[PDB]
Amino acid sequence: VYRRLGLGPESRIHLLRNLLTGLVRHERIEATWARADEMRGYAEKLIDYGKLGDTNERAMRMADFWLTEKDLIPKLFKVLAPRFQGQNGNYTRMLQIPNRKEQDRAKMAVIEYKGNYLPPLPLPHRDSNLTLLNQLLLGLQQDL
Amino acid sequence: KFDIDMLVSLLRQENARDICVIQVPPEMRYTDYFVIGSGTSTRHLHAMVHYLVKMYKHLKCRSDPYVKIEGKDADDWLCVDFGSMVIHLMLPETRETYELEKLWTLRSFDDQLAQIAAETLPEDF
Amino acid sequence: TQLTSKLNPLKDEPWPLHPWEPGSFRVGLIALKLGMMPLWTKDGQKHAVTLLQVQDCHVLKYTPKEDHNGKIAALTVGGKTVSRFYKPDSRLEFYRDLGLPPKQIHKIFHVTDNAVIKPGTPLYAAHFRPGQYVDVTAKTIGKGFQMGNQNRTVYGLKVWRVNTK
Amino acid sequence: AVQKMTRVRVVDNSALGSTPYHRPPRCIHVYNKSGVGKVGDQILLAIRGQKKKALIVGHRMPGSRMTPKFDSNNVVLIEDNGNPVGTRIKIPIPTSLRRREGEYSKVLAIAQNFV
RNA sequence: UUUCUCCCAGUACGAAAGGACAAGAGAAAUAGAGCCACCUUACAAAUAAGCGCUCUCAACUUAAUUUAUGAAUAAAAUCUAAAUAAAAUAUAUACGUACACCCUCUAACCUAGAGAAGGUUA
């Protein structure tokens, strides 16, 4: 249930720790698809710790350990946590990007923090209902 | 049915010299009755042991299965385990040496219990 | 709608019912393995038991004795309905004629002529009864290259209880 | 439990068992179709440089549920004729030996302590 | 799958001594196929393992041999490289189990898998 990355399990935590810290600072990070999926679960769980409250000692310990840069700790409790108070989940959005042209052709994906101020990503749009097929289905819906 | 009173009467008929019967309270998780019997000689011990089992099988006990006889190889101690009673049959002289009656009559005050000793088991080096 | 339409076999021109005679073979069922748990008897003994659930068990195709195997005829039964989105049209076409949603697995059961049942008849766990010994065959768990994923049969398994609901 | 080697505590008043000795009493053979010896299983114990059959009454191996796990391996000596070598047993002995297949009445009679 | 005990039964049998069968039941053992409710060791992950638990087979077709009928051979003969009727090991496949379906495949997921294949998809 866990990918093998880095030179060891501790390196994976440190690698995951670095990735989590980078995401918070920028809110949008591009990395290999396998690594991005691995870090997605941790990011969502951290927001739950932020929602728990700043005064929570466990959250403070967790926030301090995971976020190397301490200026982010106020941001989590005063920017990230307040923003997603309404939402119950799905805080992180991960999308596929064309593979890197670095001679290794690794699978590339982009993971972003939802609600950010960054420019909107070019997300896919479903087919419009004005299409012939959709219109026919709409007629069936109306009859029913 | 085969019960305590019938067996002891059968034991008397075959002339058991010494019979000891000890009841067990409900708290103690063992047979309700513990029985010890004396017999003059191994031939008498074999005869009496067979007689009780034959009577037991004949005397109903259909629900209960057949009872195997333990200790027939030994010439001084034969014991048969019935459904509600266990009879331990031995010679008269063998009776005093073992003192099964003291063990049950005196649950914790039997003299032979103290006779047990301890040891030490050190390593070679 | 399809399931409700097939709920009543006896009200859908049921095939003639024949009396039992020695040597008759009844059809089998397909069930899902829920899990295992301990079961106790009136003797105080604890017996581990396995849970099998019969889901959407229906007769699908009847094969005549001569046309399938001269020794005995066979009946096809399928359960555990599956989605229609990611399946070929050929499989859907066959089930559309039968009037039932597609089933995960098709299995063939050897059934005597007297015990033949019209296709589309719903089969329930009540076919078996407590106290009856039954035979279950299933594919073994696959282990990869080191294996498994081979059909095996277990014989002489008693049935302790059936949950009708 | 008691098996090849597996130095055991001789719970008996037998002269060899009762007398202290510098080497512990180990087992040489298990009188069962399987090689594992548990409570109620005859074994070929060794005492005072002699080989004497012993009956296992306790083991430290994990057991089935609803049963007490002993912290020490206990055995009872049995003569060739089948009568116990010792006339008394000190450690509490489980009463399941009565129902166990075999001849256990003699040992149970000699076992005043039952748990 | 194999062994052992019990039962049948201290019976049948036998002057006694002694002492069976077949059928049935209970214990184990090992082999094979599996499984994780419990226990135990691990992963100090939701998993994998045993030291844990469950389940495991039928004989159409015969051979050594033993009889019946019966000529050659005048029989109240002869089992017959005489014509003929029977009984009688182990083998094995008559008897089964398992397989049977005919192929959507962007992508995702999988106890499926080296790759491929395979399964799943509100």
Curated annotation (Swiss-Prot), chain A:
User: Annotated Gene Ontology MF terms?
Assistant: protein domain specific binding; structural constituent of ribosome
Compartment(s): Mitochondrion
Keyword list (alphabetical) reads: Mitochondrion, Ribonucleoprotein, Ribosomal protein, Transit peptide
> Would the keyword Mitochondrion be found if you checked this record's keyword annotation?
yes
On the tree of life, the source organism's domain of life is Eukaryota
Coiled-coil annotated spans = none
Write out the GO cellular component annotations. mitochondrial inner membrane; mitochondrial large ribosomal subunit; mitochondrion
The Gene Ontology biological process terms listed for this entry are: mitochondrial genome maintenance; mitochondrial translation; translation
Q: What is its main location?
A: mitochondrion
Q: Which family does it belong to?
A: Belongs to the bacterial ribosomal protein bL17 family.
Quaternary structure note? Component of the mitochondrial ribosome large subunit (39S) which comprises a 16S rRNA and about 50 distinct proteins.
Name of the featured protein? Large ribosomal subunit protein bL17m
Q: Which residues of the full protein are shown?
A: 14 to 157 of 176
Swiss-Prot record, chain B:
User: Tell me, what is one Gene Ontology molecular-function annotation carried by this entry?
Assistant: mitochondrial large ribosomal subunit binding
Protein name in the entry: Mitochondrial assembly of ribosomal large subunit protein 1
State the organism of origin. Answer: Mus musculus (Mouse)
Subunit record text: Associates with the mitochondrial ribosome large subunit (39S) via interaction with MRPL12 and/or MRPL14. The interaction generates steric hindrance that is expected to prevent premature association of the 28S and 39S ribosomal subunits. Identified in a complex composed of MALSU1, MIEF1 upstream open reading frame protein and NDUFAB1; within the trimeric complex, MIEF1 upstream open reading frame protein functions as a bridging scaffold that interacts with MALSU1 on one side, and with NDUFAB1 on the other side. Interacts with MRPL12 and MRPL14.
Full protein segment contained here: 85 to 209 of 228
List, in alphabetical order, the GO biological process terms annotated in this UniProt record: negative regulation of mitochondrial translation; ribosomal large subunit biogenesis
What main location does UniProt list? mitochondrion
Q: Which UniProt keywords apply?
A: Mitochondrion, Ribosome biogenesis
Subcellular location as annotated = Mitochondrion matrix
| This protein's GO CC annotations | cytosol; mitochondrial matrix; mitochondrion
Curated annotation (Swiss-Prot), chain C:
Provide the protein's localization: Mitochondrion
Could you tell me the superkingdom of the organism this chain comes from? Eukaryota
Family designation: Belongs to the universal ribosomal protein uL3 family.
Q: How does it assemble?
A: Component of the mitochondrial ribosome large subunit (39S) which comprises a 16S rRNA and about 50 distinct proteins.
Record's protein name: Large ribosomal subunit protein uL3m
User: Taxonomic lineage per UniProt?
Assistant: Eukaryota, Metazoa, Chordata, Craniata, Vertebrata
UniProtKB/Swiss-Prot annotation, chain D:
Q: Which UniProt keywords apply?
A: Mitochondrion, Ribonucleoprotein, Ribosomal protein, Transit peptide
What Gene Ontology terms for biological process does this UniProt record contain? mitochondrial translation
Where in the cell is the protein located? Mitochondrion
MF terms from GO for this chain are: structural constituent of ribosome
Gene Ontology cellular component? mitochondrial inner membrane; mitochondrial large ribosomal subunit; mitochondrion
Q: Which domain of life is it from?
A: Eukaryota
Quaternary structure (record)? Component of the mitochondrial ribosome large subunit (39S) which comprises a 16S rRNA and about 50 distinct proteins. Interacts with MALSU1.
Which family does this protein fall into?
Answer: Belongs to the universal ribosomal protein uL14 family.
Described purpose of this protein according to its UniProt entry:
May form part of 2 intersubunit bridges in the assembled ribosome. Upon binding to MALSU1, intersubunit bridge formation is blocked, preventing ribosome formation and repressing translation.
Q: What is this protein called?
A: Large ribosomal subunit protein uL14m
Q: Which residues of the full protein are shown?
A: 31 to 145 of 145
